A paper describes a structure:
The system studied was a reversibly switchable fluorescent protein (rsFP) which is a representative of a class of proteins that undergo a reversible photolysis reaction from a highly fluorescent “on” state to a weakly fluorescence “off” state. The specific rsFP used, rsKiiro, is a mutant of Skylan-NS33 specifically developed for ultrafast time-resolved crystallographic studies due to its ability to form crystals that diffract to high resolution (∼1.1 Å for single-crystal cryo-MX), high photoswitching quantum yield (∼18% Trans-to-Cis in the crystal), and high protein expression yields. Structurally, rsKiiro is similar to green fluorescent protein (GFP) with an 11-stranded β-barrel surrounding an α helix. The chromophore of rsKiiro is formed from the Ala-Tyr-Gly tripeptide at residue numbers 62–64 in the α helix.
In this study, we probed the light-induced reverse reaction, from the Trans to Cis chromophore conformation, initiated with 2 ms 405 nm pulses at a range of optical flash energy densities (0.1–6.7 mJ/mm2) after the initial Cis-to-Trans photoconversion had been driven to completion using ∼13 mW/mm2 of 473 nm CW illumination. A total of 435,200 images were obtained across 6 laser energy densities at 405 nm of 0, 0.1, 0.53, 1.78, 6.74, and 14.43 mJ/mm2. From these images, 79,976 single-crystal indexed diffraction patterns were obtained and merged into 6 data sets for each corresponding laser energy density. Data below a value of 0.5 in Fourier shell correlation were discarded, leading to a uniform limit of 1.7 Å being applied to all data sets. The initial examination of the chromophore-omitted maps clearly shows increasing occupancy of the Cis state at higher energy densities.
Residue numbers in the entry: 2 to 61, 65 to 221
Write the structure that this text describes.
Amino acid sequence: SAIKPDMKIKLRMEGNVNGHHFVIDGDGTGKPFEGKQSMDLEVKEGGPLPFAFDILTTAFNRVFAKYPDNIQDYFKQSFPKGYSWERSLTFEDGGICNARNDITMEGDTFYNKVRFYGTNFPANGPVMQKKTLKWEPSTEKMYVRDGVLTGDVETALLLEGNAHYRCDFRTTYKAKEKGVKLPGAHFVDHCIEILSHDKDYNKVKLYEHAVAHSGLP
């Protein structure tokens, strides 16, 4: 196993949401086999961010997910060469973006080159007014579509005032190494949370727990 029980995480995101440019650095640790990771995020340019930090967080690696013996682990088989993913997020009020991560490994560290581009968010909407509280726990449906491993998520951000703001993610995953065998269809349950933050979310601690299953208890 190229992958140790304790891996470090290094991360730089460059992005633009509704024109606003920003650069964010990440430093964290994770237990790939337990499906748990936590990282410290710091806005380096464009702070304070004039949009809800929450829209970024699923962009800050499915190598951190507990996979049972009876499901092919595409992600942990992708290393040490690594893999990329591209995501389109579609929000109920027309907000749309495209995120991509190119993930590499050097010794005991995952390096993440992340790009995040959002547009079409209404000025008066919860994202540009900062009314989001958190992502609800999700289930990612994994299946193969024209020879590409694809994950679908139908989820929502909880807003101030008991309201939900609906998300649809589609992610395409691709190993760098030709001939990493595709898995069969399956599910990954996700638990993403902001553990702490300063006034304007210039510093954020982020935690994710993920578990792969076939649908049964």
